[PDB]
């Protein structure tokens, strides 16, 4: 019942590729980055989402009015 | 000269997978008991199966004595102790009339 390692490929057959470190010359591609006010607005939207989904615990609803 | 052998059991345990093996063994055995043997054998609702001659042969060194019922009287003593510690009324359960889920 069930298979064996003799009936299957190895962990060296799978994943046979060793590591090669790629490098690329710098032409100036990571310069002049725009959207300088992006993360401020992202944090504002995040806090807005948290505020609209906020719910304070109001135990005063359980007061013995009866 | 510093050694985890004589100065840190934690780093010794971390640096040796063959020390993790007994701990995983223990955890798996206890999880197996929790999943399978707990409710089927050890619970009070499932403890009379030890009186079975097929599934628990001679658990009491003999066939189970049903005229004596040691399980019944032991557990009855324990429930009586619980009732006396809680000061619960025995006859309050008999005043209940459950409805039916009509329709």
């Amino acid at each position: 019942m069930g298979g064996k390692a003799s009936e299957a490929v190895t962990i060296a057959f799978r994943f046979p590729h060793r590591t090669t470190f790629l490098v690329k010359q710098n032409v100036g591609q990571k310069l002049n980055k725009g959207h300088q006010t992006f993360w401020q607005l992202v944090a504002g939207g995040w806090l807005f989402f948290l505020l609209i989904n906020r719910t304070s615990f109001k135990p005063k609803l359980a007061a013995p009015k009866v | 000269v510093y050694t985890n052998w004589q100065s840190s059991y934690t780093r010794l345990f971390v640096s040796k997978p063959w020390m993790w093996h007994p701990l995983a063994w223990m955890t798996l055995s206890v999880g197996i008991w929790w999943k399978f043997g707990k409710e089927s054998l050890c619970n009070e609702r499932s403890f009379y199966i030890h009186t079975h001659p097929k599934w628990a042969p001679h658990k009491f060194h003999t066939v189970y004595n049903w005229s004596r019922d040691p399980i019944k009287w032991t557990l009855a003593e324990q429930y009586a102790s619980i009732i006396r510690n809680t000061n619960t009324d025995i006859e309050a359960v008999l005043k209940i009339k459950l409805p039916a889920n009509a329709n």
Binding site: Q29, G34, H35, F38, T55, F57, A62, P64 | I96, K97
Partner: protein, 186 residues
């Protein structure tokens, strides 16, 4: 930071006397389930956006460029041989999802890069952790408020516990009403 302590005993009560659960209580629990499930996705989104706020262009191109997304299956020599893969072929090998498009837009966005490690990861995990915990906390708060405004047995139990009473005393006080009004004691 106080509703979960009551909700524990309330949930034990509900599990025991589950026969006494209404449809509105069922819907409240289903809404809490919905909030719990959406909190995971919100945490994933916050983690992505936080790590992307601290990932360099190399770390981003690791997820866009198919040279890096093909390391499991494809030889690196197929990418070193120029002309092996065509431009359209590289295009179909690039990821098309919304995260990939977000990162593609984020290439041209100024940010505050860090070296790939525990801080770039913590900057995503912390917002995700706070999002998840706060959403679940506020969901449980909403659940408790709905139970307190719910005119039912569980609402009465929750109210009696919110007064400041002990669990056993509250169970006895509520079962005294259940036996009389609900069950019709002899």
């Amino acid at each position: 930071t106080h509703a979960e302590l009551h909700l524990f005993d309330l949930d034990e009560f509900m599990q025991t006397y589950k026969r006494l659960q209404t449809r509105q209580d069922w819907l409240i629990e289903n809404k809490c389930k919905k909030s719990r499930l959406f909190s995971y996705v919100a945490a994933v989104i916050a983690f992505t956006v936080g790590k992307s706020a601290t990932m360099s262009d190399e770390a981003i191109l690791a997820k866009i460029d198919p040279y890096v997304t093909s390391e499991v299956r494809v030889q690196r020599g197929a990418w070193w041989r120029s002309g092996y893969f065509t431009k359209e072929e590289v295009e179909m090998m690039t990821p098309k999802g919304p995260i990939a498009r977000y990162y593609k837009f984020l290439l041209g966005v100024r940010r505050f890069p860090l070296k790939h490690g525990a801080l770039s990861w913590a900057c995503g995990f912390v917002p995700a952790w706070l999002t998840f915990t706060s959403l679940n906390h506020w969901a449980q708060n909403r659940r408790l408020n709905r139970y307190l405004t719910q005119e039912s047995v569980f609402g009465e139990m929750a109210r009696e516990l919110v007064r400041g009473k002990t669990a056993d005393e509250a169970t006895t006080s509520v079962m005294a009403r259940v036996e009389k009004e609900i069950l019709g004691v002899h």
